[PDB]
Design a protein around this motif. Sequence first.
Motif, PDB file in Angstrom:
ATOM      1  N   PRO A  34     -64.626 -44.494 -50.759  1.00 16.66           N
ATOM      2  CA  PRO A  34     -63.395 -45.136 -50.308  1.00 16.66           C
ATOM      3  C   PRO A  34     -63.079 -46.421 -51.083  1.00 16.66           C
ATOM      4  O   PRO A  34     -64.047 -47.083 -51.490  1.00 16.66           O
ATOM      5  CB  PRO A  34     -63.747 -45.513 -48.844  1.00 16.66           C
ATOM      6  CG  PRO A  34     -64.713 -44.386 -48.423  1.00 16.66           C
ATOM      7  CD  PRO A  34     -65.562 -44.249 -49.645  1.00 16.66           C
ATOM      8  N   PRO A  74     -56.421 -50.525 -47.818  1.00 13.45           N
ATOM      9  CA  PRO A  74     -56.257 -49.153 -47.344  1.00 13.45           C
ATOM     10  C   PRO A  74     -57.200 -48.647 -46.281  1.00 13.45           C
ATOM     11  O   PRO A  74     -56.879 -47.689 -45.566  1.00 13.45           O
ATOM     12  CB  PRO A  74     -56.460 -48.327 -48.595  1.00 13.45           C
ATOM     13  CG  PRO A  74     -57.238 -49.192 -49.504  1.00 13.45           C
ATOM     14  CD  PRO A  74     -56.868 -50.616 -49.207  1.00 13.45           C
ATOM     15  N   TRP A  75     -58.372 -49.259 -46.171  1.00 18.16           N
ATOM     16  CA  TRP A  75     -59.397 -48.810 -45.196  1.00 18.16           C
ATOM     17  C   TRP A  75     -60.038 -50.032 -44.543  1.00 18.16           C
ATOM     18  O   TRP A  75     -61.156 -50.341 -44.784  1.00 18.16           O
ATOM     19  CB  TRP A  75     -60.385 -47.951 -45.987  1.00 18.16           C
ATOM     20  CG  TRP A  75     -61.419 -47.155 -45.277  1.00 18.16           C
ATOM     21  CD1 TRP A  75     -62.338 -47.644 -44.405  1.00 18.16           C
ATOM     22  CD2 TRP A  75     -61.752 -45.761 -45.478  1.00 18.16           C
ATOM     23  NE1 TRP A  75     -63.178 -46.648 -44.010  1.00 18.16           N
ATOM     24  CE2 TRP A  75     -62.871 -45.498 -44.676  1.00 18.16           C
ATOM     25  CE3 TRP A  75     -61.238 -44.719 -46.245  1.00 18.16           C
ATOM     26  CZ2 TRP A  75     -63.475 -44.252 -44.605  1.00 18.16           C
ATOM     27  CZ3 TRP A  75     -61.834 -43.477 -46.170  1.00 18.16           C
ATOM     28  CH2 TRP A  75     -62.934 -43.247 -45.358  1.00 18.16           C
ATOM     29  N   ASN A  77     -61.797 -52.416 -41.639  1.00 12.47           N
ATOM     30  CA  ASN A  77     -62.732 -52.159 -40.515  1.00 12.47           C
ATOM     31  C   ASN A  77     -61.930 -51.803 -39.266  1.00 12.47           C
ATOM     32  O   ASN A  77     -62.328 -50.921 -38.488  1.00 12.47           O
ATOM     33  CB  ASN A  77     -63.665 -53.360 -40.282  1.00 12.47           C
ATOM     34  CG  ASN A  77     -64.706 -53.045 -39.252  1.00 12.47           C
ATOM     35  OD1 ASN A  77     -64.651 -53.525 -38.130  1.00 12.47           O
ATOM     36  ND2 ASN A  77     -65.684 -52.202 -39.630  1.00 12.47           N
ATOM     37  N   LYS A  78     -60.823 -52.517 -39.011  1.00 11.67           N
ATOM     38  CA  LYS A  78     -59.954 -52.309 -37.845  1.00 11.67           C
ATOM     39  C   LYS A  78     -58.589 -52.925 -38.070  1.00 11.67           C
ATOM     40  O   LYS A  78     -58.396 -53.801 -38.945  1.00 11.67           O
ATOM     41  CB  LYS A  78     -60.586 -52.836 -36.581  1.00 11.67           C
ATOM     42  CG  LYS A  78     -60.970 -54.276 -36.654  1.00 11.67           C
ATOM     43  CD  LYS A  78     -62.106 -54.468 -35.619  1.00 11.67           C
ATOM     44  CE  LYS A  78     -62.907 -55.701 -35.762  1.00 11.67           C
ATOM     45  NZ  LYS A  78     -63.607 -55.854 -37.046  1.00 11.67           N
ATOM     46  N   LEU A  92     -55.740 -50.974 -30.673  1.00 12.04           N
ATOM     47  CA  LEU A  92     -56.204 -50.634 -32.030  1.00 12.04           C
ATOM     48  C   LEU A  92     -55.307 -49.566 -32.617  1.00 12.04           C
ATOM     49  O   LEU A  92     -54.858 -48.602 -31.905  1.00 12.04           O
ATOM     50  CB  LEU A  92     -57.657 -50.197 -31.970  1.00 12.04           C
ATOM     51  CG  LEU A  92     -58.603 -51.249 -31.422  1.00 12.04           C
ATOM     52  CD1 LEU A  92     -59.977 -50.647 -31.197  1.00 12.04           C
ATOM     53  CD2 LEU A  92     -58.693 -52.440 -32.412  1.00 12.04           C
ATOM     54  N   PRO A  94     -55.228 -46.789 -36.017  1.00 16.00           N
ATOM     55  CA  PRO A  94     -56.159 -46.207 -36.943  1.00 16.00           C
ATOM     56  C   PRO A  94     -55.814 -46.544 -38.400  1.00 16.00           C
ATOM     57  O   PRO A  94     -54.653 -46.586 -38.746  1.00 16.00           O
ATOM     58  CB  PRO A  94     -55.974 -44.691 -36.735  1.00 16.00           C
ATOM     59  CG  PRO A  94     -54.568 -44.575 -36.325  1.00 16.00           C
ATOM     60  CD  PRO A  94     -54.204 -45.828 -35.555  1.00 16.00           C
ATOM     61  N   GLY A  95     -56.797 -46.745 -39.261  1.00 18.40           N
ATOM     62  CA  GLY A  95     -56.542 -47.043 -40.672  1.00 18.40           C
ATOM     63  C   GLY A  95     -55.766 -45.940 -41.379  1.00 18.40           C
ATOM     64  O   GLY A  95     -55.002 -46.207 -42.320  1.00 18.40           O
ATOM     65  N   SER A  96     -55.860 -44.700 -40.859  1.00 20.74           N
ATOM     66  CA  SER A  96     -55.126 -43.563 -41.369  1.00 20.74           C
ATOM     67  C   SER A  96     -53.616 -43.754 -41.243  1.00 20.74           C
ATOM     68  O   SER A  96     -52.920 -43.025 -41.979  1.00 20.74           O
ATOM     69  CB  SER A  96     -55.532 -42.275 -40.663  1.00 20.74           C
ATOM     70  OG  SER A  96     -55.444 -42.439 -39.287  1.00 20.74           O
ATOM     71  N   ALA A 160     -50.211 -43.664 -33.635  1.00 21.60           N
ATOM     72  CA  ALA A 160     -51.340 -43.318 -34.523  1.00 21.60           C
ATOM     73  C   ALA A 160     -50.922 -42.410 -35.649  1.00 21.60           C
ATOM     74  O   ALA A 160     -51.762 -42.114 -36.468  1.00 21.60           O
ATOM     75  CB  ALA A 160     -52.476 -42.729 -33.707  1.00 21.60           C
ATOM     76  N   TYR A 161     -49.677 -41.929 -35.701  1.00 26.77           N
ATOM     77  CA  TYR A 161     -49.289 -40.910 -36.695  1.00 26.77           C
ATOM     78  C   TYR A 161     -49.410 -41.498 -38.117  1.00 26.77           C
ATOM     79  O   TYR A 161     -49.179 -42.703 -38.350  1.00 26.77           O
ATOM     80  CB  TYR A 161     -47.837 -40.471 -36.528  1.00 26.77           C
ATOM     81  CG  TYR A 161     -47.661 -39.489 -35.387  1.00 26.77           C
ATOM     82  CD1 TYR A 161     -47.883 -38.183 -35.684  1.00 26.77           C
ATOM     83  CD2 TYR A 161     -47.351 -39.877 -34.101  1.00 26.77           C
ATOM     84  CE1 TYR A 161     -47.734 -37.203 -34.714  1.00 26.77           C
ATOM     85  CE2 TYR A 161     -47.206 -38.889 -33.109  1.00 26.77           C
ATOM     86  CZ  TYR A 161     -47.438 -37.589 -33.436  1.00 26.77           C
ATOM     87  OH  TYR A 161     -47.347 -36.586 -32.465  1.00 26.77           O
ATOM     88  N   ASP A 162     -49.773 -40.649 -39.058  1.00 25.15           N
ATOM     89  CA  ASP A 162     -49.733 -41.053 -40.470  1.00 25.15           C
ATOM     90  C   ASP A 162     -48.360 -41.683 -40.777  1.00 25.15           C
ATOM     91  O   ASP A 162     -47.334 -41.218 -40.317  1.00 25.15           O
ATOM     92  CB  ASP A 162     -49.949 -39.875 -41.413  1.00 25.15           C
ATOM     93  CG  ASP A 162     -51.362 -39.297 -41.460  1.00 25.15           C
ATOM     94  OD1 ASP A 162     -52.262 -39.800 -40.812  1.00 25.15           O
ATOM     95  OD2 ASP A 162     -51.523 -38.322 -42.229  1.00 25.15           O
TER      96      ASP A 162
ATOM     97  N   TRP B  75     -69.026 -48.062 -41.171  1.00 30.44           N
ATOM     98  CA  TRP B  75     -67.605 -48.450 -41.344  1.00 30.44           C
ATOM     99  C   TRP B  75     -66.757 -47.195 -41.544  1.00 30.44           C
ATOM    100  O   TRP B  75     -66.279 -46.936 -42.606  1.00 30.44           O
ATOM    101  CB  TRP B  75     -67.543 -49.434 -42.524  1.00 30.44           C
ATOM    102  CG  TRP B  75     -66.289 -50.202 -42.783  1.00 30.44           C
ATOM    103  CD1 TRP B  75     -65.045 -49.678 -42.954  1.00 30.44           C
ATOM    104  CD2 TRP B  75     -66.175 -51.611 -43.078  1.00 30.44           C
ATOM    105  NE1 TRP B  75     -64.165 -50.656 -43.288  1.00 30.44           N
ATOM    106  CE2 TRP B  75     -64.829 -51.838 -43.409  1.00 30.44           C
ATOM    107  CE3 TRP B  75     -67.053 -52.697 -43.091  1.00 30.44           C
ATOM    108  CZ2 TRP B  75     -64.332 -53.090 -43.715  1.00 30.44           C
ATOM    109  CZ3 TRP B  75     -66.561 -53.944 -43.394  1.00 30.44           C
ATOM    110  CH2 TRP B  75     -65.225 -54.128 -43.720  1.00 30.44           C
ATOM    111  N   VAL B 223     -52.177 -35.478 -35.479  1.00 33.31           N
ATOM    112  CA  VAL B 223     -51.585 -36.832 -35.492  1.00 33.31           C
ATOM    113  C   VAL B 223     -52.025 -37.617 -36.714  1.00 33.31           C
ATOM    114  O   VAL B 223     -51.185 -38.269 -37.370  1.00 33.31           O
ATOM    115  CB  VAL B 223     -51.960 -37.539 -34.187  1.00 33.31           C
ATOM    116  CG1 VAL B 223     -51.354 -38.927 -34.178  1.00 33.31           C
ATOM    117  CG2 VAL B 223     -51.518 -36.737 -32.963  1.00 33.31           C
TER     118      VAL B 223
END
Lengths: 259, 266
Positions: A34, A74-75, A77-78, A92, A94-96, A160-162, B75, B223
Amino acid sequence: MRLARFDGGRLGVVIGDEIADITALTGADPAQWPDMNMIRLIRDFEGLRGAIEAALPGLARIPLAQVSLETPVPWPNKIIAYPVNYHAGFFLKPGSALSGPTDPVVLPAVPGREVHHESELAIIIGKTCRSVAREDWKDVVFGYACLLDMVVRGRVFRKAYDTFCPVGPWITTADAVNDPATLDMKLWVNDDLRQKANTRDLVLDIPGMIATASAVMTLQPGDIIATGTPEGVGPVVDGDRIRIVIDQVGEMAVDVVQG
Amino acid sequence: MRLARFDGGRLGVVIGDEIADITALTGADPAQWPDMNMIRLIRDFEGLRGAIEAALPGLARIPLAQVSLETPVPWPNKIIAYPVNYHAHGRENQGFFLKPGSALSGPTDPVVLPAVPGREVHHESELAIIIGKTCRSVAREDWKDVVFGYACLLDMVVRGRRVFRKAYDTFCPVGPWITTADAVNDPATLDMKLWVNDDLRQKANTRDLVLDIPGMIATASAVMTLQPGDIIATGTPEGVGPVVDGDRIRIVIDQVGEMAVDVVQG
């Protein structure tokens, strides 16, 4: 200083209408997966900033017109988000969901529901930290970016959607913002102003949001804190263009496409 | 195969009561920060499995007693949790939520209780699914293509009438290793047990999941793009209850793993 990712994870410093490529100077590997290069640059920045400034004149400069800027972290931790939080707990993301300044927001085909924009100021954390005191908040902030918090109107999954968390177009380092509690933030959909506020109207202020989040979780370099959204949240549809401006921080615009 | 992190991000294969260091043969850098070495091994595992098997006869085996096992994926891109998700009668809700990577803890680390007078911290035993592939909109019938393996997970929670109540540091023990999916014949038939000190507190079988493993994969991936190393917490059965300072929590999931963690007051 304005720090950006571009053209497949290269690192650059944005200078006027150009970007200076710091990939080779910093020993970043844009092929890394990553891709954590920006998080290491953030962690190490007080030890690298002088070097970057000294070497800058000899670096390759490319017009911004000729690169594709990407999301700067891009990625993480939170991604910690405070809902509402403007004068007329955290969750929270998501990183996605992260997307960049040149990527479209892709709407799910959600029968009978709207997708809404939310303009927000993002805080970028710069230091590993826990239980930060209000008085010490500046010690742990690397900088700031523009953020869009896209939402299916109705649940955690609806944020949460991309593509529902555009962040960009760069990080502005904290030293370059005089007072992040005095900033005007604007959002337009096409030509029409839809949200406008000043961060002086945050309910839980920036030191409060850092103290709160770090009371529960160890924060890390690169973590994103989404600080809330003012009034004017409303729908986007296929073909719309969302523009966000935060004074002293940045500006980006993204296209909306039906998936 | 059982894959573990130990002694500052070394990568190992767990063989009986020993571990073989595979850091050098996988190209891992234990000094890497953030430490993404297990994610890269997961992404490349089908390509590296043969190299591991060929090397193992020649590798020094270290007794597990002499190492400190760490959480296997420190992580992840995300931790996706399904609340409840077991039938109370064994036989044959605001949706999934997210937990912060910061909450992850290893099999030798204590669960550190926040000071919450008037409130309790509860255990939740869960099976963790470890994703193996970048994927989106996975059909139920294609679930096996994206599952790397399985681990034990404890979903600790401050009880109240809130996302932050599951987000405190140490509130997501995951370990003690990842069991690769090929080593589990059917993950829909596994017995899971949790003890606090000497007493059995939770016991279930994954045949009693409400939303089954393919369902949980199809739902999350409808999702979100999933990534190698992503953790899916599959839910917890009845018997959730309190832990206090000095307690020892033991979780066993047949065919997957066993770990025990101490509970300390913060």
